[PDB]
Design a protein around this nucleic acid. Structure first.
Lengths: 124, 128, 216, 4, 109, 34, 225, 62
RNA sequence: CGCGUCCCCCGCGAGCGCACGGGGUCGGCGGCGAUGUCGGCUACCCACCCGACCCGUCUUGAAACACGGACCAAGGAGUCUA
RNA sequence: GAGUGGCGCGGACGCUACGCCGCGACGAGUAGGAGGGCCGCUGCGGUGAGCCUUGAAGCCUAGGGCGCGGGCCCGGGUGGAG
């Protein structure tokens, strides 16, 4: 369970990276990238993750499915969104609110997605 | 221009000089590194007028401005590009400082990756 | 509908009404004043019509934000500030300009402008100073006055007129308004004797002169 | 009630 | 044309006897020799004008060698007409017994 | 909240007293013309 | 339905408003009563002294009930009996102040910490000045500023002291619940005397500024408040 | 500049269990909420007893 | 400052606005700008004012006409078992 | 509190709970006692898909900074294998 296998990995995990009075976690589905019970991408049943696409353009929204959770090859559903900035974020807000899938991660997922799109956008 | 921080409060410091060790002036054996004097007659220890100052917790900096660089950012120390995507979302308050023993060919990858991610580097044009 | 009558009770001292709330009930006559009990505008398009929204959502969110402030009360913007005159600054009083390029020059005060800056004119025929603005705390109001009771200062010269647009060249408007106003002040200074030469002279501190004794 |  | 500042002799520092406080400076303005003669100078601006080796930009024209530390008269000090002032950085102690300028232009007349 | 009432009454009472004292001085000025 | 729900919440809010206005009116009318009580208190002693002098007899008035005690000397080199009495009065710091009501018990406690305190009989003005400017309550053992009346009303509601004018009345006219109103007030952290002292060490009678300063304590209250 | 003895300024009771036992630590998490958010005194007694050493929470016989 | 009603004497009106109101804001301005100037507290050198006796140790009491210490680097002293 | 009768698809930050936040009083100190060290040294089990001949340790430095401090991190030089 969540609170159980938090008390194991809160201080003694591979991903934990302590220096300069700052604590991050390099987890494959952490968004805001920090040591927390909320944003940890391994603990929970429900998990949302935003990555840059396999190619240059687009993002990839990763949804951890309810059913089989000791089943890591089939545990994650990946979808790509290569649209305009507003229509990319609107799709994410409609995936997270209108499924009632981690509504506390809605705003953090839109901020991360926006940062990924602003990153893959050329410099003058 | 520069990559400006999210807030610029004016970083007030209670003291600017170091706390030099007692009788570090005279002896080359005595380092400048601080050591609390525990001698039974020591002037510095029993706080005589116009001697070397001893550190207290009173000198402690504001919790808002603590570890904050003159610019307004806070440092994070980075060895490879896998340790930047950590800072991606901590962007406006935190900045990367690429370590001493990272090779030239890896600095030219970290700064050309941090330029894309819009993360500040404090030592961007080191070796070249 | 109803014409708003200005405050029925006067002000005795700041924050304090003249009349109490029993007097005031009768004063307003409330014994015969008793009472009982957008977003998406549509647009026609050349396969149907569309629903646009003025104020539609942002495309970019920044990675970190600042929250909203708390609420304070007495923090007004500069346009709405109450403007003081120092009592000695009477329209027609001969000031002594202290700070800028024209420091030590004695100059006739015309009127307090809308932003608290003194509109001031040492006649350009005498002092070589135009229709210029000054600050109250950078002058000395002397006990020297001439009667400016009648003459009409142009109204179009105000705090927006004197603002630096962004070498500087004197407009013909400025020169007409200068000789327009000064043609009405020159006969008033040339009335009282030795006064034009007094304005032409420059204020200075000598040996044995302490300002704490001199009445000026 | 005595306001009415 | 002529002078537009009263002449204040920088007497020394705000102090007890065996403990001086350099943040406040004691001014002796010439002519004023009482506490009922120094109401005029309270709040006025003070300048320690000096000149040093290198060129430093001037507000109003050419880069000169001249420099300033702006102050401000705060209080009257003692019974016989001396004045406390406070400067943007502490005055140098080489200035003791040297001229500083009492201005007129936070003017109250 | 009674402070407002006391202050208003005090200012009005002082004003009336000053007016009466000024009138008495005016009566003295009348007597000194007489 | 919700039309009913918000109507009920609006009613309960309006009920809370009219309860506020009713209490507020009680604060106004009690302050008007206390004003009338103080003026007739003041007039009476002038009347009684006049009718005494008209007959040719004397009017010895009431020996005062209320004292204001200021600690003038510090923490260093102090006797244990003088220590215990000073911390029983709650004068644990130089230039701390408390009101103590005079009886037989308290006067014989005052005269044994005599050289460490400067005390006397306060004025109505001084009692107003001290409790309005330096008024802090001992609410949850925490020194909290009396900015509102909902501190005094919530703490001293049981004794019918619901405002600042009630507090000042119960202190000045030494009433029933002086103990629970004086112990509510955190000891008054006064400034240094502006104008200086005469002499700290000796008695008031022999030039100094220690011991009983009968009506002259109000002057010391002005310079330290 | 005030005469207080600071001997007894700190209080020497437990605010947390010394044990790094996670199951005990989740029970303490669970009963800190109930001690705070109920006017029950039972939850305050049980929470306090969850902190105490083995020599202070002894074995009750059947 | 409604009467429709409870004494001995003679329970939801409506707005708008100003603010001595649970901690500062401006819907105010003005200069100077590419090898000669702007900023850089800390840090190198120097000057001036104030303060300022040399550490360690035993001692009631150490700057002591009390003892140890010319200077520098590396080693160097509450450990393990019952 | 609850029942039966009389258009527009929107809403900042948060909560390493061993965390974050709010309010009040306080702060000398030898011998001595306790706590916290993201103070430092050397080796072992884990771990960083760590760093490194495109230059590791070490050393020097009027360079840039952080920390109340123990200390530490970058820049330049030397050095050549950790």
């Amino acid at each position: 369970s969540a609170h159980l296998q938090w008390m194991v990995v809160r201080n003694c995990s591979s991903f934990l990276i302590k220096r300069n009075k700052q604590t991050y976690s390099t987890e494959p589905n952490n968004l805001k990238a920090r040591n927390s019970f909320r944003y940890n991408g391994l603990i929970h049943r429900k998990t949302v993750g935003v990555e840059p696409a396999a190619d240059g353009k687009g993002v990839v929204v990763v949804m951890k499915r309810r059913s089989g959770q000791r089943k890591p090859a089939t545990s994650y559903v990946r979808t790509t969104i290569n649209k305009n900035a507003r229509a990319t974020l609107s799709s994410i807000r409609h995936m997270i609110r209108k499924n009632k899938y981690h509504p506390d991660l809605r705003m953090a997922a839109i901020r991360r997605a926006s940062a990924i799109l602003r990153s893959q956008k050329p410099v003058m | 221009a520069a990559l400006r921080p999210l807030v610029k409060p004016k970083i007030v410091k209670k003291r600017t000089k170091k706390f030099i060790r007692h009788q570090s002036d005279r002896y080359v054996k005595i380092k400048r590194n601080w050591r609390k004097p525990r001698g039974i007659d020591n002037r510095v220890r029993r706080r005589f007028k116009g001697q070397i100052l001893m550190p207290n917790i009173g000198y402690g900096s504001n919790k808002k401005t603590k570890h904050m660089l003159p610019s307004g950012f806070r440092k994070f120390l980075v060895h490879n590009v896998k340790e930047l995507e950590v800072l991606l979302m901590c962007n406006k308050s935190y900045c990367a400082e690429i370590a001493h023993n990272v090779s030239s060919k890896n600095r030219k990858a970290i700064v050309e990756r941090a330029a894309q991610l819009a993360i500040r580097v404090t030592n961007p044009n080191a070796r070249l | 509908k109803g014409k708003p009558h200005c405050s029925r009770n006067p002000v005795l001292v700041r924050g304090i009404g003249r009349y109490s709330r029993s007097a005031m009930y009768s004063r307003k006559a409330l014994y015969k004043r008793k009472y009982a009990a957008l977003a998406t505008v549509t647009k026609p398009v050349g396969g149907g019509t569309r629903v646009v929204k003025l104020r539609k959502m942002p495309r970019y969110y920044p990675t970190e934000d600042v929250p909203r402030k708390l609420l304070s009360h007495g923090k007004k913007p500069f346009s709405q500030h109450v403007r003081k005159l120092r009592a000695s600054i009477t329209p027609g009083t001969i000031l002594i300009i202290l700070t800028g390029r024209h420091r030590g020059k004695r100059v006739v005060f015309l009127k307090q402008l809308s932003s608290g800056l003194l509109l001031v004119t040492g006649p350009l025929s005498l002092n070589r100073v135009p229709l210029r603005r000054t600050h109250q705390k950078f002058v000395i109001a002397t006990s020297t006055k001439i009667d400016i009771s009648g003459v009409k200062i142009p109204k179009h010269l105000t705090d927006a007129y004197f603002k630096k647009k962004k070498k500087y060249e004197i407009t013909e408007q400025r020169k007409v308004d200068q000789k327009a106003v000064d043609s009405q002040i020159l006969p008033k200074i040339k009335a009282v004797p030795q006064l034009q030469g007094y304005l032409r002279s420059v204020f200075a501190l000598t040996n044995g002169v302490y300002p704490h004794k001199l009445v000026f | 009630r005595g306001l009415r | 044309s002529g002078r537009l500042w009263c002449k204040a002799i920088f007497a020394g520092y705000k102090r007890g006897l065996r403990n001086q406080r350099e943040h406040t400076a004691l001014l002796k303005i010439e002519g004023v020799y009482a506490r009922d003669e120094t109401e005029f100078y309270l709040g006025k601006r003070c300048a320690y004008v000096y000149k040093a080796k290198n060129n430093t930009v001037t507000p109003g024209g050419k880069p000169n060698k001249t420099r300033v530390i702006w102050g401000k008269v705060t209080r009257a000090h003692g019974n016989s007409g001396m004045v406390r002032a406070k400067f943007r950085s502490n005055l140098p102690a080489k200035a003791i017994g040297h001229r500083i300028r009492v201005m007129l232009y936070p003017s109250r007349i | 909240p009674y402070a407002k009432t006391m202050r208003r009454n005090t200012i009005l009472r002082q004003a009336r007293n000053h007016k009466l004292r000024v009138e008495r001085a005016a009566a003295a000025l009348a007597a000194k013309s007489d | 339905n919700f039309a009913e729900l918000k109507i009920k919440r609006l009613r309960k809010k309006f009920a809370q408003k009219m309860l506020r206005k009713a209490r507020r009116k009680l604060i106004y009318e009690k302050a008007k009563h206390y004003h009338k009580e103080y003026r007739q208190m003041y007039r009476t002693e002038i009347r009684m002294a006049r009718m005494a002098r008209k007959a040719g007899n004397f009017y010895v008035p009431a020996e005062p009930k209320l004292a204001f005690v200021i600690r003038i000397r510090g923490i260093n080199g102090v006797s244990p009996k003088v220590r215990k009495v000073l911390q029983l009065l709650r004068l644990r710091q130089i230039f701390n102040g408390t009101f103590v009501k005079l009886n037989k018990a308290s006067i014989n406690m005052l005269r044994i910490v005599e050289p460490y305190i400067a005390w006397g009989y306060p004025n109505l003005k001084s009692v107003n000045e001290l409790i309005y400017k330096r008024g802090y309550g001992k609410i949850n053992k925490k020194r909290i500023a009396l900015t509102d009346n909902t501190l005094i009303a919530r703490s001293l509601g049981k004794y019918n002291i619901i405002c600042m004018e009630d507090l000042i009345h119960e202190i000045y006219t030494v009433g029933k619940h002086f103990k629970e109103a004086n112990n509510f007030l955190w000891p008054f952290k006064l400034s240094s005397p502006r104008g200086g002292m005469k002499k700290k060490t000796t008695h008031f009678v022999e030039g100094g500024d220690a011991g009983n300063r009968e009506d002259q304590i109000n002057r010391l209250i002005r310079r330290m408040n | 500049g005030v005469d207080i003895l600071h001997n007894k300024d700190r209080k020497v009771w437990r605010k947390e269990p010394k044990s790094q036992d996670m199951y005990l630590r989740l029970l303490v998490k669970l009963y800190r909420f109930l001690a705070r958010h109920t006017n029950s005194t039972f939850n305050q007694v049980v929470l306090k007893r969850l902190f105490m050493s083995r020599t202070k929470r002894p074995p009750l016989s059947l």
